[PDB]
């Protein structure tokens, strides 16, 4: 069993954090999904809407097929920071599964709060990783009740909310995090609070009744959860001077997995201090979560990484070390790098640092 993969990063220079990213992998092992074949495509686009205010138009299109059933999700959302801790979003979208579909619109705010930050930590740790915190969501959402399936589900939830007392917001968590999603919460050192429902009402919309709910929850992390530890970094609106996009797809069945990713986006490199830059620290959640599925078959690694620096730049530090260099082009394969690839595919979070400069 051989895992074949290839990765490529092409960096912009100057004050830019942008890079082009490409990833390909193929491995002839069964996927762990208990319905196969399963295929999926995703595209995400972000464009500056109002750069003066810092408003970003963010879209996502997801299409999948699971055991022959076609699913889609489309969301269009306007996102902006109000403060360094508070972010707001306004959007709309739709979903479909087979012959069924429904739409939605929403307004929400998210507030990120770090627990007990200190100057003594900040000035002594040059590259901090684990930052603990809690993140509060406040959501208003509206869904037209425009078929009888929607009406039935609306009524079912009204009954539970009215009658279930404290149980409703507690027990909803095993409904929400379906299948193996529930176990993955603790695996990443994450916590999900009970849900609080502030109001749930039917409003008279233009084309009929609309189910309107305002609700809240928080989630917390011990530092592995990048959504909290890296709140600001994960939304690089200041560097979005042009549209960014990423596209990915996979095909899987009982005899293999194939995946492609292609993107162009800011945030791929970061200032590392003292004139040096680094490839951004690897986010941890993806490694930890994928780690829950990456140990089911033995494999050997056939993997190359190519990094193309801006003209005139040079790698100052890399561990594992690159295998070859041709001017600004650097390549990793085999040896220590292959062992690192095996490690992260199985859930390991060992650091691979790349530092570069002029």
């Amino acid at each position: 069993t051989t895992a074949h993969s290839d990765y490529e990063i092409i960096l912009e220079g100057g004050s830019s954090s942008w890079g082009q990213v490409k990833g390909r992998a193929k491995v002839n092992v069964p996927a762990a999904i208990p319905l196969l074949p399963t295929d999926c495509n995703i595209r995400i686009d972000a464009k500056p809407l109002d750069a003066q205010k810092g408003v970003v138009r963010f879209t996502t299109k997801i299409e999948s097929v699971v055991d022959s059933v076609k699913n889609t999700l489309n969301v269009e959302v306007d996102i902006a920071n109000e403060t360094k801790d508070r972010r707001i979003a306004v959007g709309e979208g739709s979903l479909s599964v087979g012959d069924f579909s429904h739409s939605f619109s929403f307004e929400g705010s998210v507030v990120n709060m770090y627990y007990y930050r200190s100057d003594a930590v900040r000035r002594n740790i040059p590259n901090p990783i684990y930052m603990q915190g809690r993140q509060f969501h406040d959501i208003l959402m509206k869904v037209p009740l425009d078929n009888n399936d929607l009406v039935d589900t609306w009524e079912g939830f009204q009954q539970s909310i009215s009658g279930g007392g404290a149980n409703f917001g507690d027990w909803i968590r095993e409904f929400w995090f379906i299948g193996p999603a529930f176990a993955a919460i603790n695996e990443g050192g994450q916590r999900i609070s009970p849900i609080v429902v502030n109001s749930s009402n039917v409003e008279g919309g233009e084309k009929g009744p609309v189910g309107v709910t305002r609700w809240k929850f928080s989630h917390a992390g011990s530092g592995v959860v990048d959504s909290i530890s890296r709140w600001t970094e994960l939304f690089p609106v200041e560097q979005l001077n042009k549209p960014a996009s990423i596209e990915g797809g996979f095909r899987s069945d009982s005899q293999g997995i194939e995946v492609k990713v292609d993107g162009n986006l800011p945030g791929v490199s970061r200032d590392a201090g003292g004139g040096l830059r680094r490839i951004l620290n690897h986010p941890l959640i993806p490694l930890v979560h994928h780690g829950m599925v990456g140990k089911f078959n033995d494999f050997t690694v056939d993997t190359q990484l190519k990094i193309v620096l801006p003209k005139g730049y040079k790698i100052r530090y890399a561990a594992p070390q690159f295998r070859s260099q041709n001017l600004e082009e650097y390549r990793w394969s085999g040896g220590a790098y292959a062992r690192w690839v095996e490690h992260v595919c199985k859930g390991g979070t060992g650091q691979f640092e790349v530092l570069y400069a002029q």
Copy 2:
């Protein structure tokens, strides 16, 4: 290190869901039990008691030896559905450990509740897997206090129940799910509620004092928990027109594991719609749980599966595909099937579907 295994399924035809199942495995790796050697035999029998009412007499006999200590458990229980959601049980049994034994009798009800089921899901998903829900237990149990060990433990629990307040039903969970059982709860996306004790009293039985307790708990699942997702299917009383039975045993120590299973029971095949039948979907809990121990030693797979269909039937779909066919007899070995066997032994839940018809 080679894992040798063999599985065989022989199906009944017509409207029958019955099959004979045989499994053998031998692998020369240490078991994970921190006391070795450990051996165990189990037999389960079910026979129709009152088919008109749908009452089943269910017995279980377990015998084990752990670090030279002999344990037994015998239970005889009458089980029936009252409704599609509520099931009742009345039974008695005994247990022994070394020189100690005690008996018990009980009456209980279990109510299964799915969370928010919908017509839009039902009509669009041809083979649903994850179904979230919660399952309520109501138990009355009676144990004769007929030696001083029983009396001592009774008193210890009375103290905790009386004095412990809300702590008792909370903290009992780490007592109940001894050793690695506690960690396995979250692993399967399962939740166990605190216990509620309604009453605990000494009654005057025929041959002396009897400790009588009525207590309740619920457990919930995000869909991996088959006890909830597949509540009806897991008790195929309608197909029990004759006695069913299964027998299994293992021997384990620090240099190997050997296991045998032999059974004859309904529910091995299921209607898949449109004239097709399938081997029942693989239950998930066993894979997930065994997965917690299946990754401690590298192994290669030496494994065959034989499925014998009823005369005149043919496989319509199988993935991974069978290696050979001789009329109604189909065999799997090597290649993609061997990779699938490795996958599920390590905790993977990738679908292996077998569809057959006339």
Copy 3:
């Protein structure tokens, strides 16, 4: 990828439980730490202070370097049993990270409580492993507020304690168990209670203000947690007739891990009943926890174990069996022992029992 390791145990005879322990390992795989290189040294010393009262002076010195930042911790503590269930400690120490340091002093009590112990278990199980219980901590600690970082953090916590209500003692847990420590709690069948703060005040110390807090928590275990299951055994004060010490260090980076351990301490052997002695049962937590990192790279085992018995003693039982014997010296390598080493490095808890006698 080959893991090279060597272990050695040299036992004292007579009524002594003492042994010398040596361990070496080197493996060329990346460590999982998301900051590398990381190096660490630890020394622990225990000496009898007041043998008549059973007071032990316990010190620990830890020095580490993480991504070039130097950290230290020094603690000196006087420990004694008050009863078989209650232990007290009084100590002081300091820590430093880069340019920052702070000191502390504390007094604490810990009470271990087993859940529902029974005579029927005790007399029938010759070597019990899983013992469920809960362990209560009561801590008074004092920290001089002698720089502005300390003052700032003090104020931050005062705000949370005053304003946070029940949330403070709940949410502190994901702060406390930073990074992957949080996930490891459930993995070992462990539970940590919310913290209760009894008082938090500034006192006027000799050299300025001192932050004084009294707080409580408990932790519980289903039996894997050795701190609870083996409470008495883990503090063998009765056998400490001379100083004991252990020293360990590791070096790790993205291309390997190297580790050394050297110690001399009581508790290495134990009475097994009927004139036999055993090497102490393997503690489980270390195996379970290390197990969370031991599955990220395939490896083969190159490992030897040497046990040197007291003169005239002989091994009565060992499984896996030793490979060779030269009078009192016994050696394990390859075969079943190598498979056992692989097993425990990956998180397995299979028993390796060694029994010896005259």
